[PDB]
Amino acid sequence: STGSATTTPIDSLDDAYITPVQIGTPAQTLNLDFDTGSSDLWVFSSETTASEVDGQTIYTPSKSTTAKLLSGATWSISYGDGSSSSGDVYTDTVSVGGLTVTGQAVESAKKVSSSFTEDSTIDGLLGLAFSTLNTVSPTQQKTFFDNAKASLDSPVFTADLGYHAPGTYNFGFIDTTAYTGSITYTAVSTKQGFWEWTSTGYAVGSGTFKSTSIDGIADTGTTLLYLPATVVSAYWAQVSGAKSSSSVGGYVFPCSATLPSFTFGVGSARIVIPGDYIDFGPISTGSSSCFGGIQSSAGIGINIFGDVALKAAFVVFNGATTPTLGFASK
Ligand SMILES: CSc1[nH]nc(N)c1S(=O)(=O)C(C)C
Numbered sequence: 177s178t179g180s181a182t183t184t185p186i187d188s189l190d191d192a193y194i195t196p197v198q199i200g201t202p203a204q205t206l207n208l209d210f211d212t213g214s215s216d217l218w219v220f221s222s223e224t225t226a227s228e229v230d231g232q233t234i235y236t237p238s239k240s241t242t243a244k245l246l247s248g249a250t251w252s253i254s255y256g257d258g259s260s261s262s263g264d265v266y267t268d269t270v271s272v273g274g275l276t277v278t279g280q281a282v283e284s285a286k287k288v289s290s291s292f293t294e295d296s297t298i299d300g301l302l303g304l305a306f307s308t309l310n311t312v313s314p315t316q317q318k319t320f321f322d323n324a325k326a327s328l329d330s331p332v333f334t335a336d337l338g339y340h341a342p343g344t345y346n347f348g349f350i351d352t353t354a355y356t357g358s359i360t361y362t363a364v365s366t367k368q369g370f371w372e373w374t375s376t377g378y379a380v381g382s383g384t385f386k387s388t389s390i391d392g393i394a395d396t397g398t399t400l401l402y403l404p405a406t407v408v409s410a411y412w413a414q415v416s417g418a419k420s421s422s423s424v425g426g427y428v429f430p431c432s433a434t435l436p437s438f439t440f441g442v443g444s445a446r447i448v449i450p451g452d453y454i455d456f457g458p459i460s461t462g463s464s465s466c467f468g469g470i471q472s473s474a475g476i477g478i479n480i481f482g483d484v485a486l487k488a489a490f491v492v493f494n495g496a497t498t499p500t501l502g503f504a505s506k
Pocket of ligand 1 (some may be wrong): 191316399400424425456457458459461467
């Protein structure tokens, strides 16, 4: 089997991407944030505290003839941005882009933090990291991908995120029309539960490439590119007037600037992030100070190749017995 679904930016900045997902019988379609940095599929639901729902579409398990309470199971997750959610668990039929999994754990939110409430466009998350990170207790549950894997034509999924445009998540096949040149594959460590890999270095604009190992995670659920302070300082030093602002919470730059590109290494290959991809617009409406798309990972404890990086590439998440990651230009 295979699946193919379009993923769409939630706003004009590509803060996140939503992908329609069918849950239950008859289908209830919710727009979920596919997150390769976590491993829970959770949804706004009929059980979510009413004051914490503000425009989201909810899953109502009582209206699904295939929903079953997973008795005794609870979940609770905290994300890198400080947001969180928790609740109980049902199993139900879940389909993405034509690919169907029966008995998928669907984690029903009883509580969500303010950031989730305030984002009317995201109805929940679909985790695509390794199932060892799944938070369901006392019986850990598998991700949608892990459940689907054996039925897929090939044990892979791909992320093809758009810049200010829709893109695609494919399951079970590699669309050879969706990228240019060749795909370069690189080793993955699953030791922390992430799609963790090591970039071979970077360049800023038309500058020389610096060969240096940068260990980080491929994370579709993080908006920006978070890298070591040395790398980030070298980037922003090429933008007149750019500075790190503790009050704003990162690097800002004059909105009048033209940003340089940023290149990262994948083995001997190179992925180029255009300057425009690094512009996250005015810090507040009407401001002439703009927020940068490359930020320091110091304090986070891990480097994160978030959407800013991933949307510059066609990315293969290879879930073979020894997982690997592939990157192509597009
Ligand atoms: C990607 S977060 C962001 N992008 N553009 C902004 N203005 C913001 S913010 O959250 O208001 C803050 C970090 C400046």
